[model samples]
Target: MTEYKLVVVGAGGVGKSALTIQLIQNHFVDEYDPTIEDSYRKQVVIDGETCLLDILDTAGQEEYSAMRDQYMRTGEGFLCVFAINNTKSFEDIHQYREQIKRVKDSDDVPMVLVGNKCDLAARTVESRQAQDLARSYGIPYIETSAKTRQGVEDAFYTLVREIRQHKLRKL
Candidate 1:
């Protein structure tokens, strides 16, 4: 059974759990739990190739920064999340991205920059700004609305696509 480890990281209330829910279940919850319990783990096959993804939905608590670093260190890739309407969370992405890079000791890890809460586009912070931040870090940026189920699957499945791109045989 081939598997890939993917960890989601972000500051408090940035919706890491909600993004995980969006990916695996297509549901959104406003009642933040801020608890860690191995939120999800599943197998998804893409293009006849099967891969297991162990998705960790962790607490947004700053106290767990060390645990978050450990998880990031062991994972093969990541989904760094932030809110589209919250500049503070958006700004914190740089720290998360940098921390992961430093802890993991590899900037090559494939990470998807998730701008969540697209359901409230009216309160959007600015797509261009998020895109620029992601560009600076050299990661693909995607906007998702767990509330509306927008780009939820793409958030995870697209990571599969990008990762698989490095080694695909032409038909």
Candidate 2:
């Protein structure tokens, strides 16, 4: 089985943990605690191929800035998260992408731009805007609702597919 290391990143309260937990455990967590880099492992079958997924849920706090590069370096793929209702979080998505490129020293790494909190009624950043930003970076864009568990699996599955395809090209 292939192993894929996925790093989840975004600003505070953007539902990084919520989305991760929803994907792996199929439950929604309603608490907000600043993460200090928590890792989760799960086995999944995509396209009839089994693989192990190791997800690193990262801190969005300013104090955790020093550790971001370390997580970026070890990640095989990335989910750059942002809240649809929080424009500040949406604005910083590019910084995360740039950091990943800088730490990995490559711009062609597998990644997906995630717009989370889709269950909320009011959104500050529209879906079209998020999709445009992702297009500018040449990455897939997914809108997910952790509360409703919608599009959560699709986000992870898409990134994993990209990761596997990227690896195949290196052969």
Candidate 3:
């Protein structure tokens, strides 16, 4: 079966669903709704292989530690999202990473640091800072605008590529 489990994690108002929906629908959501672990699937060809991207647009509305581990245990790769204009959301990436590592009992995981809301002019989290943080975590970093669809495909595709690379190493 062609299946890949990908999780989207972030604090509130970080465009997590926006990015995920953008990838799945090639569209944007005007109103933000707090989610409770919405699941989506898309069969797409990436790198010439057909894959069912089982994406979890996770909840910021639920208890942080309570509901997340269930999905984290099964997620093969992750898109750790943060709003570029929100400093707190950017800082929350560490907590999400810690929890992912904790639940998986592994230090290294296939994931990407996604900075969303790049269309906004009010910038609080600098690009250099995000790049450094990603470098320190040893993960690829990308910026996206769910509204404008910038880097949306690259962000999800990058995670799938990371997962593909990780699997190749195991072989």
Candidate 4:
């Protein structure tokens, strides 16, 4: 079995853990510690094939954001998370690229840029705009709600499915 490491990243209070839990357990916690991180592994079969996903649910610490970016560069795939209502997280998405380039040494890394908190439409500031930006950057993007379990598994599974497809292409 091939091991795939995927990292979820964003600034503080961007629901990084919420998204991970929703995807892994199909549920989200109403109360969470923003400073805590919970990383784990899971198995999934994409296209009738089994694969290993070592997911790292990192914290959104400003001091550790740089290190988090480095973590992203190491993975075969990524989940760049941001909230629909928080424009800062949207802006941090751009910053993430810079750090990836610095550590990963290449921009060709496969990544999924997620705009979380889609359930809260009234506070959205970058749904359409972020989608457009993602297109311009040539990365897969989506607006999701972890609280409602929307786009939970699909978000991570999409990346795994794509990576599997790419690997088969090289065979």
- Angstrom error of the Cα, residue 65, model 3: value is 4.0
Clashes of 4: 0
| Residue range 1-171, candidate 2, lDDT tens digits | 878888886676677777777777767766747745677788766556768887777875573335455666678887876888887777777777777777877887778888787765788988788889888778888888778776877788888878877677876
Could you give candidate 1's per-residue lDDT for residues 140-163 as a string of tens digits? Answer: 778886676666566776666666
Best by TM-score: 3
What TM-score would you give candidate 2 relative to the actual structure? 0.88
Instruction: Give the per-residue lDDT of model 4 (tens digit) for 1-171.
Output: 777777776665677777776666656675656666656577655556777776677665455454454355456666767887887777877777556555666876666777777775564554677877677557777767787665766677666766766887886
Stretch of 10 with least lDDT, candidate 4: 61-70
For each of the candidates, the C-alpha root-mean-square deviation to the true structure, in angstroms, is 3.0, 2.0, 2.0, 2.5
The residue pairs that clash in candidate 1, if any, are none
Q: Considering TM-score, which of the candidate structures 3 and 4 is the better prediction for this target?
A: 3
lDDT of 1 at 163: 64
Q: What shift in Å separates residue 68 of candidate 2 from its native position after superposition?
A: 3.4
Model 2 lowest lDDT segment of ten: 60-69
TM-score of each: 0.83, 0.88, 0.89, 0.83
**Candidate 3, residue 160: how far the Cα is off, in Å:** 1.5
> Candidate 2, residue 42: CA error in Å?
1.4
Candidates ranked by lDDT, best first?
3, 2, 1, 4
Global lDDT for candidate 2?
Answer: 0.75
TM-score of 3: 0.89
